[PDB]
């Protein structure tokens, strides 16, 4: 059922790598080297995702070769997702998905691992894994391995709900969305490409974990809002509609209220942490700011979510002056309510 989006608030300016053209060329040459498509139409559609531009907006100061290297991860994700999820009228069974997805998790860990059956573009996963991780620090590689596995595990949870034809509760969605969207993996690739790495103390600290989870969650709620029109589940709109027994359109103001409250908490934790932040935590926070803006700027020009080739699936609803839910109270969802304990 059709919805009308509300305008988005973002207090951070647009940013883009000034060598985007070179980044895009490196990525298109890689897409053609590994033939990440079955036909010319698929090739055009994959290029039209503009995965290079999304990373270039998240990494405006990074070396273009390294932005291209991490962009391969997202192009591979799009090319593989356009295959595994387009697997017939019947929904993918979790029992069929799990044995394949653990093989891809293994290749991300150790690309020398090979199997008796491999899906198309597995050679490309080996190549991008080496390209991204070979120049990285040991600590960055450990983070790449753990965050890749968490994403693949998250995907399996989405498959479970799709098989059952069921919608998760809002509390369960708010716990798992950060995993199903692989935003920890995103953050790991920002560190590798931009050349930053959190101390174990910072990475483990509950305030930084709350910063990472709140950012991860609201970023992927924006993803859900931009994707809904094209999708028309486990979309925030469908989850809230079921939770509150209301229409998808009635769910919209609730979705933006949650977005405002989680984004608001992120900004509070950002304000708490920046003064004492070392160069690595400062670099991560910069990457988080650039990612928030990047998702909105790229989201409404990419063919991935909002745009046809033709009238877009989702027109840009505009920019909001302030977030109109300023309630500082913790969200009543005990999977994530602990974030608010970390406000100084």
CSV table of C-alpha atoms in Angstrom, one decimal, residues 19-204:
chain,number,residue,atom,x,y,z
A,19,UNK,CA,38.5,11.7,-8.2
A,20,UNK,CA,35.1,9.9,-8.4
A,21,UNK,CA,35.5,9.6,-12.3
A,22,UNK,CA,38.8,7.5,-11.7
A,23,UNK,CA,37.1,5.5,-8.9
A,24,UNK,CA,34.1,4.6,-11.2
A,25,UNK,CA,36.5,3.6,-14.1
A,26,UNK,CA,38.5,1.2,-11.8
A,27,UNK,CA,35.1,-0.3,-10.6
A,28,UNK,CA,33.6,-0.7,-14.1
A,29,UNK,CA,36.9,-2.3,-15.4
A,30,UNK,CA,36.7,-4.7,-12.4
A,31,UNK,CA,33.0,-5.5,-13.1
A,32,UNK,CA,33.9,-6.3,-16.7
A,33,UNK,CA,37.1,-8.3,-15.7
A,34,UNK,CA,34.9,-10.6,-13.5
A,35,UNK,CA,31.8,-10.4,-15.8
A,36,UNK,CA,29.5,-9.5,-12.7
A,37,UNK,CA,26.4,-9.8,-15.0
A,38,UNK,CA,24.6,-12.4,-17.2
A,39,UNK,CA,23.8,-9.9,-20.1
A,40,UNK,CA,24.3,-6.2,-21.2
A,41,UNK,CA,21.0,-5.1,-19.5
A,42,UNK,CA,22.3,-6.6,-16.1
A,43,UNK,CA,25.7,-4.8,-16.7
A,44,UNK,CA,23.9,-1.4,-17.2
A,45,UNK,CA,21.7,-2.0,-14.0
A,46,UNK,CA,24.8,-2.9,-11.8
A,47,UNK,CA,26.7,0.2,-13.0
A,48,UNK,CA,23.5,2.3,-12.4
A,49,UNK,CA,23.6,1.3,-8.7
A,50,UNK,CA,26.5,3.8,-8.5
A,51,UNK,CA,28.1,1.8,-5.6
A,52,UNK,CA,31.4,3.8,-6.3
A,53,UNK,CA,29.6,7.1,-5.8
A,54,UNK,CA,28.1,6.0,-2.4
A,55,UNK,CA,31.6,5.0,-1.1
A,56,UNK,CA,33.2,8.2,-2.7
A,57,UNK,CA,30.6,10.3,-0.7
A,58,UNK,CA,31.4,8.3,2.5
A,59,UNK,CA,35.2,8.7,1.8
A,60,UNK,CA,35.8,12.2,0.3
A,61,UNK,CA,39.5,12.3,1.4
A,62,UNK,CA,40.6,8.6,0.8
A,63,UNK,CA,42.9,7.5,-2.0
A,64,UNK,CA,40.7,6.7,-5.0
A,65,UNK,CA,42.3,3.2,-5.6
A,66,UNK,CA,41.3,2.2,-2.0
A,67,UNK,CA,37.7,3.7,-2.4
A,68,UNK,CA,37.5,1.6,-5.6
A,69,UNK,CA,38.7,-1.5,-3.7
A,70,UNK,CA,36.0,-1.3,-1.0
A,71,UNK,CA,33.3,-0.3,-3.6
A,72,UNK,CA,33.9,-3.8,-5.2
A,73,UNK,CA,32.4,-5.3,-1.9
A,74,UNK,CA,29.1,-3.4,-2.5
A,75,UNK,CA,29.0,-4.1,-6.4
A,76,UNK,CA,29.5,-7.8,-5.5
A,77,UNK,CA,26.8,-7.6,-2.8
A,78,UNK,CA,24.3,-6.0,-5.4
A,79,UNK,CA,25.3,-8.5,-8.2
A,80,UNK,CA,25.0,-11.5,-5.8
A,81,UNK,CA,21.7,-10.2,-4.1
A,82,UNK,CA,20.1,-9.7,-7.7
A,83,UNK,CA,20.8,-13.5,-8.1
A,84,UNK,CA,20.2,-15.4,-4.8
A,85,UNK,CA,16.9,-13.5,-4.0
A,86,UNK,CA,15.7,-13.7,-7.6
A,87,UNK,CA,15.6,-17.6,-7.3
A,88,UNK,CA,12.0,-18.3,-8.4
A,89,UNK,CA,8.4,-17.6,-7.3
A,90,UNK,CA,8.9,-19.8,-4.1
A,91,UNK,CA,10.9,-18.0,-1.3
A,92,UNK,CA,14.5,-19.1,-0.5
A,93,UNK,CA,14.4,-21.8,2.3
A,94,UNK,CA,16.7,-21.0,5.3
A,95,UNK,CA,17.9,-24.7,5.3
A,96,UNK,CA,19.1,-24.2,1.6
A,97,UNK,CA,20.5,-20.6,2.2
A,98,UNK,CA,22.6,-21.4,5.3
A,99,UNK,CA,25.1,-23.9,3.7
A,100,UNK,CA,25.8,-21.4,0.8
A,101,UNK,CA,26.1,-18.3,2.9
A,102,UNK,CA,28.6,-19.9,5.4
A,103,UNK,CA,30.8,-20.7,2.3
A,104,UNK,CA,30.8,-17.0,1.3
A,105,UNK,CA,31.6,-16.0,5.0
A,106,UNK,CA,34.5,-18.5,4.8
A,107,UNK,CA,35.8,-17.0,1.5
A,108,UNK,CA,35.7,-13.5,3.2
A,109,UNK,CA,37.8,-15.0,6.1
A,110,UNK,CA,40.2,-17.0,3.9
A,111,UNK,CA,39.8,-16.7,0.1
A,112,UNK,CA,42.2,-19.7,-0.5
A,113,UNK,CA,39.2,-21.9,0.8
A,114,UNK,CA,37.3,-23.6,-2.2
A,115,UNK,CA,34.2,-25.7,-2.4
A,116,UNK,CA,32.6,-28.5,-4.5
A,117,UNK,CA,29.9,-26.0,-5.6
A,118,UNK,CA,30.3,-22.2,-6.0
A,119,UNK,CA,27.7,-19.6,-7.2
A,120,UNK,CA,28.7,-17.1,-9.9
A,121,UNK,CA,31.0,-14.2,-8.9
A,122,UNK,CA,32.7,-16.3,-6.2
A,123,UNK,CA,36.1,-15.6,-8.0
A,124,UNK,CA,35.2,-11.9,-7.7
A,125,UNK,CA,34.6,-12.3,-3.9
A,126,UNK,CA,38.1,-13.8,-3.6
A,127,UNK,CA,39.6,-11.0,-5.7
A,128,UNK,CA,37.9,-8.1,-3.8
A,129,UNK,CA,38.7,-9.8,-0.4
A,130,UNK,CA,42.4,-9.8,-1.2
A,131,UNK,CA,42.3,-6.3,-2.8
A,132,UNK,CA,40.6,-4.8,0.4
A,133,UNK,CA,42.4,-6.8,3.1
A,134,UNK,CA,46.0,-7.5,1.8
A,135,UNK,CA,47.2,-3.8,2.4
A,136,UNK,CA,45.2,-3.6,5.7
A,137,UNK,CA,46.5,-3.9,9.3
A,138,UNK,CA,46.1,-7.2,11.2
A,139,UNK,CA,43.5,-5.5,13.5
A,140,UNK,CA,41.5,-4.2,10.4
A,141,UNK,CA,41.6,-7.7,8.8
A,142,UNK,CA,40.2,-9.2,12.1
A,143,UNK,CA,37.4,-6.6,12.0
A,144,UNK,CA,36.7,-7.3,8.3
A,145,UNK,CA,36.4,-11.1,9.1
A,146,UNK,CA,34.0,-10.6,12.2
A,147,UNK,CA,31.8,-7.9,10.5
A,148,UNK,CA,31.5,-9.9,7.2
A,149,UNK,CA,30.3,-13.0,9.2
A,150,UNK,CA,27.8,-10.9,11.2
A,151,UNK,CA,26.3,-9.5,7.9
A,152,UNK,CA,26.0,-13.1,6.4
A,153,UNK,CA,24.4,-14.3,9.7
A,154,UNK,CA,22.0,-11.2,9.6
A,155,UNK,CA,21.0,-12.1,5.9
A,156,UNK,CA,20.1,-15.7,7.2
A,157,UNK,CA,17.6,-14.0,9.7
A,158,UNK,CA,15.9,-12.1,6.8
A,159,UNK,CA,15.6,-15.4,4.9
A,160,UNK,CA,14.0,-17.1,8.0
A,161,UNK,CA,11.2,-14.4,8.0
A,162,UNK,CA,10.8,-14.5,4.2
A,163,UNK,CA,10.4,-18.4,4.3
A,164,UNK,CA,7.8,-18.1,7.1
A,165,UNK,CA,6.0,-15.2,5.4
A,166,UNK,CA,6.1,-13.4,8.8
A,167,UNK,CA,7.0,-9.9,10.0
A,168,UNK,CA,9.3,-9.5,13.0
A,169,UNK,CA,8.2,-7.4,16.1
A,170,UNK,CA,9.6,-3.8,16.2
A,171,UNK,CA,11.9,-4.7,19.1
A,172,UNK,CA,13.3,-7.7,17.2
A,173,UNK,CA,13.7,-5.6,14.0
A,174,UNK,CA,15.5,-2.8,15.9
A,175,UNK,CA,18.0,-5.5,17.3
A,176,UNK,CA,18.7,-7.2,13.9
A,177,UNK,CA,18.4,-4.4,11.2
A,178,UNK,CA,22.0,-3.3,12.0
A,179,UNK,CA,23.2,-6.9,11.3
A,180,UNK,CA,21.0,-7.5,8.1
A,181,UNK,CA,22.3,-4.2,6.6
A,182,UNK,CA,26.0,-5.0,7.4
A,183,UNK,CA,26.7,-1.4,8.7
A,184,UNK,CA,29.5,-2.9,11.0
A,185,UNK,CA,31.1,-4.2,7.7
A,186,UNK,CA,30.5,-0.7,6.1
A,187,UNK,CA,32.4,0.9,9.1
A,188,UNK,CA,35.2,-1.7,8.9
A,189,UNK,CA,35.7,-0.9,5.1
A,190,UNK,CA,35.7,2.9,5.9
A,191,UNK,CA,38.6,2.3,8.4
A,192,UNK,CA,40.5,0.2,5.8
A,193,UNK,CA,40.0,2.7,2.8
A,194,UNK,CA,40.5,5.9,4.9
A,195,UNK,CA,43.4,4.5,7.0
A,196,UNK,CA,41.9,4.5,10.6
A,197,UNK,CA,41.5,1.8,13.3
A,198,UNK,CA,39.8,2.1,16.7
A,199,UNK,CA,41.8,1.1,19.8
A,200,UNK,CA,40.3,-2.1,21.4
A,201,UNK,CA,39.4,0.2,24.4
A,202,UNK,CA,37.3,2.5,22.1
A,203,UNK,CA,35.8,-0.3,20.0
A,204,UNK,CA,34.7,-2.2,23.2
